[PDB]
Symmetry: C3
Subunit: 244 residues, 3 copies
């Protein structure tokens, strides 16, 4: 009910359809994606394009919110496991902003073709949250350790042009461009691609949090600053965090 699924040549196009929420990921959207990924090429598709309707690729977790629901991360993790395990290369057609879980989604694609007005951001430091290790590692490999530090410690927006610079974007362009590239890739040897992908994803990005990481993570998540962050936003005022 919340995604579009089409196929032309051997390219499955999976489209996030919540444009009125900038494709924010609630629980239902996350389940429907997972399913669409697992059932990709049941079936004759050799590649997937993943993209969002409207002006955003994905605005992150739904602030309504599943974002702060306790069993929401597991659905996200299962989504990511499904993409990682799929033998299909996923070309992300990033048609506009990708934030939070939405950045995570974008980075879990195998390749990225990015629209000129799209940007990338982890606003974690504005909301007092904390990321899983994989997000941090993969971001570091895609924009380089220095920019990652700036994105993670200060919520720096990564522009499209700069995403093209560091490698996070492979190409700057449109959905049609992404679909055309996926067509090429769909004509390549699948076993070679499946091998590259698996080895690539096993670069060590996938990392269980160290004990200090887990403690700092929980401490951030169950902090009062989390409340203050959303309140200041809705009240359209600056936050006053207390570090607790």
């Amino acid at each position: 009910h919340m995604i579009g699924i089409t196929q032309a040549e051997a390219v499955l196009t999976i489209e996030l359809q919540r444009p009125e929420r900038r494709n924010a990921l609630n629980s239902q959207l996350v389940e429907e994606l997972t399913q669409a990924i697992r059932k990709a090429g049941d079936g004759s598709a050799r590649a997937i394009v993943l993209t969002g309707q409207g002006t955003a690729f994905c605005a992150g977790a739904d602030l309504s919110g599943d974002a702060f629901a306790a069993d929401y991360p597991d659905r996200l993790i299962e989504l990511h496991k499904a993409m990682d395990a799929s033998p299909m290369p996923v070309v992300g057609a990033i048609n506009g902003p990708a934030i939070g879980a939405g950045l995570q989604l974008a980075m879990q694609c195998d390749l990225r073709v990015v629209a000129p007005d799209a940007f990338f951001q982890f606003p974690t430091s504005k909301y007092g949250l904390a990321l899983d290790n994989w997000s941090i590692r993969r971001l570091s490999s895609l924009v380089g350790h220095g920019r990652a530090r700036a994105m993670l410690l200060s919520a720096e927006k990564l522009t499209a042009e700069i995403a093209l610079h560091t490698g996070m974007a492979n190409r700057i362009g449109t959905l049609a461009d992404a679909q055309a590239w996926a067509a090429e890739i769909a004509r390549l040897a699948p076993l070679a691609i499946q091998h590259a992908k698996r080895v690539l994803n096993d670069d060590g990005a996938i990392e269980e949090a160290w004990p200090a990481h887990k403690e700092l993570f929980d401490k951030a998540w169950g902090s009062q600053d989390v409340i203050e962050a959303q309140v200041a936003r809705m009240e359209k005022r600056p936050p006053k965090f207390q570090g607790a």
Copy 2:
């Protein structure tokens, strides 16, 4: 008979001389190369330039033999274990085993019309882990995915951008730089090289990696890729 070795002051230059096959490696040219690396600084060399004759640095492999992969493996061990900096004068296209060899150099100067490629996904093959890890460290994880999953070329300008090329220039340029390097203190260069090479790229394949590797190599698609080329037609891969 297949390589040229010369020396000017402190700099040993090793030139691939199979420009008829665009310097494609085989049984012999690799084994000769291994010796040139070992028997360098035998000798008063403090720096090696590595390069290729004609239009190509090395366009891959051409075995038109059974221990070729061994000889290839030992070649890499040699450049890795070697105590001297190797400036790759990448004079033209560096493809497959050629990109492997170019990456095994400690530094790179790349001719303006040279490019780098792993076309494995056009031929249905798989790479070892080290090639993937090091390519990732040199062109960044993002561009590495595009090279690995889509067989995309890395042009010289982007090689300079990412760090794969330290400079754009000629064999002459490489030699000029290699000479300044020969004047640097060897023990410092040795320690840095060993630690740099030990960044984790020298990695043994995970089980799933090995399953997918063997699967790709023994696939029918590998034949299809070759037969399709010979028939100037598009491949129809089965994924088997």
Copy 3:
């Protein structure tokens, strides 16, 4: 008395300024000690961020144990400084106002963020002096300028300019000390716990590595080598060195 560093605070930003401009802010045992102390005691304190910077034309030109009374426990005093920066909950924005060479480049890399002047450069000139680096300096350099350019900096003492610092990501911005402070100010209005978590994970990328056994030997040789002696002679003599590889 007097100090080798200056400490001021504007709102929640603590600016620490290295003040050995006579020596281009070359580190010694006292300066390093004063710096360690200024980092632990920050945010003790209403400060939520640290701007690190150098007085004069250089950020920090490396090391100069010359007049130093306790230059003996300078290597260990240097390890302490790096742990305190790594352990600090405060994000540290280095304002690299000039050349950061050697230990100065190590210090620069231990900062959480870097705002670099247009005339600054970065350099590990260890191959000109025949020394060896610890694994962390090498790993963290690799992450900040990419593996390719890392070999070039380490094997041939290549200078990374401001402009190519921005390119690789070594320099987050090209700006002035004020610019570094305006940015740190913003960061000081962010949520400390999120920052604390990220920094700790980021520093635990693997760059903190114990030397492999083969690494230690090459390091110990390089440092015990005659060429180290030679390279100093050749400089204090004002002439090219003749390195022997021993």
